[PDB]
Symmetry: C2
Subunit: 183 residues, 2 copies
């Protein structure tokens, strides 16, 4: 039922590829990054580095700021609350949409994107992968792994040195000068 | 807003790779296979044939019979109702689990699997992919694409012809003569 893996002393994901498994609600590998809880149910180890499966949940007003991925495609499927997704296409045209549970957003590689959770404890199902493989361990590497359940009581704010080195390692480029005009 | 694609007259999936998009609840490309409605939000064309994203929903008691995928890994993430997932590992050990919303099941390649919807209008989020590519257009191939919304009124029955033509073009081998020994399903128990 419980396993030890390269990522956690205690996990419900098995260390060996090829093994079927089940995980109850909430019990994937957990990470905190600012106010968000990220929960990983499958990683690249489970899929020969083809895809992953994770949830992100957070408090009202939590922002994932503008960033892009050079070799990763990313799915946003809302399961709780309401999440406003901002996207810029390759040509520079911007759009925003308030996604409610069961709605879907797709962000192709090199498209700048950001989102804001607009309800308390909103939750997004994410899959993010591409030719480059998968990068779900980005969140615990920039932020921190967590054993506790539920939202971080205090936001985990990464040290500037982490921002300097970690994001490029996981195909994340933040775009701090980006401006949204989607109104 | 809408688009004409390789798969549908009217789709909310852009035909051109590299384009961001949004789709509201229910309005992905739809397919019927027996009693179930499959709704595709992203396919291989969107991800350089890396992964896909779809939902499967259906009536109480609906069963997807035993099958396996030789190169495809499959995710079950329950969003509505309750779904019992049966899996046989590579050793032959079988397990079953009732998955409720928020719960997760994973089926590695070459593992025989089946599931049963145990509430009306249960719903699964699925990803089905692997080193060989992505699996999603299987449902409308064995079954039929659909324009209406909601569960099929009557089960769409594939012609038996399709059941050993269509399977191979996709990565699915049916196991009609598979026996479950886990209980909670017909079969001889442990
Ligand atoms: Ni992103
Ligand atoms: Ni399957």
């Amino acid at each position: 039922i419980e396993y030890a893996t390269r990522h956690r002393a205690r996990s419900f994901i098995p260390p060996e590829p090829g093994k079927p498994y089940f995980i109850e609600k909430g019990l994937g590998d957990r990470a905190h990054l600012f106010g968000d809880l990220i929960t990983i149910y499958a990683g690249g180890e489970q899929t020969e580095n083809t895809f992953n499966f994770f949830t992100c949940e957070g408090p009202k007003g939590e922002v994932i700021p503008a960033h892009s991925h050079a070799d990763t495609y990313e799915v946003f499927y809302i399961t709780q609350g309401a999440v406003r997704l901002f996207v810029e296409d390759l040509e520079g045209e911007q759009h925003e949409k308030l996604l409610t549970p069961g709605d879907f957003g797709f962000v192709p590689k090199n498209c700048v994107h950001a989102y804001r959770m607009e309800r308390h404890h909103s939750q997004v199902v994410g899959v993010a992968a591409g030719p480059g493989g998968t990068f779900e361990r980005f969140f615990e590497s920039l932020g921190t792994p967590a054993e506790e359940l539920g939202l971080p009581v205090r936001p985990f704010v990464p040290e500037p040195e982490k921002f300097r080195t970690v994001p490029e390692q996981y195909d994340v480029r933040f775009r701090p000068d980006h401006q949204w005009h989607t109104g």
